[PDB]
Design a protein around this ligand. Structure first.
Ligand SMILES: CC(=O)Nc1ccc(Oc2ncccn2)cc1
Length: 171
């Protein structure tokens, strides 16, 4: 059975319990925590690519008011659906399964200025999603997994001082 498990789930849940925030900038910012997964049940002999995208979690935006995240208005039009290709792609099943798969280099941005960046809307909530694509498959077999522990609000600056402090503590 194909199993894709979140690494450092306890660490993600500490951020999630405060409501997680990720900075977006012109030139793009790496995530903390970094999304990492363990994989079992691939064909060790087959070749696969790993893709990452971000799914809009709500039909409204968010605002931080009196130390609480609350509905903040109607959403902006959805950001272009940018996909990040894990730099190890394409690779054998055995490669993906022998050690955790880390998306350490993906950058989140609020400006379309190139560089394999992912564009997100500030004050909108996203859920990371990993796709496994089988190479050389006439059926283009793809299996996608969502990671609800890793949900965050995209921000130009931290709203929750507890998030600012958690980021410094664990990073
Ligand atoms: C049957 C089928 O739908 N196959 C498929 C294969 C690869 C695909 O490329 C892709 N690119 C970016 C994000 C996600 N997916 C999409 C779809």
């Amino acid at each position: 059975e194909l199993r894709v498990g979140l690494e450092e789930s306890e660490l993600w849940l500490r951020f999630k319990e405060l409501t997680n925030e990720m900075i977006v900038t012109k030139n793009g910012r790496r995530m903390f925590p970094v999304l990492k997964v363990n994989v079992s049940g691939l064909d060790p002999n087959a070749m696969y690519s790993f893709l990452l995208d971000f799914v809009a979690a709500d039909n409204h935006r968010w605002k931080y008011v009196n130390g609480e995240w609350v509905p903040g208005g109607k959403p902006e039009p959805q950001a272009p659906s940018c996909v990040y290709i894990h730099p190890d792609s394409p690779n054998f099943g055995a490669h993906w399964m022998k050690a955790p798969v880390s998306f350490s280099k993906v950058k989140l941005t609020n400006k379309l200025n190139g560089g394999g960046q992912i564009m997100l809307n500030s004050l909108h909530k996203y859920e990371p999603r990993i796709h496994i694509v089988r190479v050389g498959d006439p059926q283009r077999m793809i299996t996608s997994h969502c990671f609800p522990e890793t949900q965050f609000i995209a921000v130009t600056a931290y709203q929750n001082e507890e998030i600012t402090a958690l980021k410094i503590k664990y990073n």
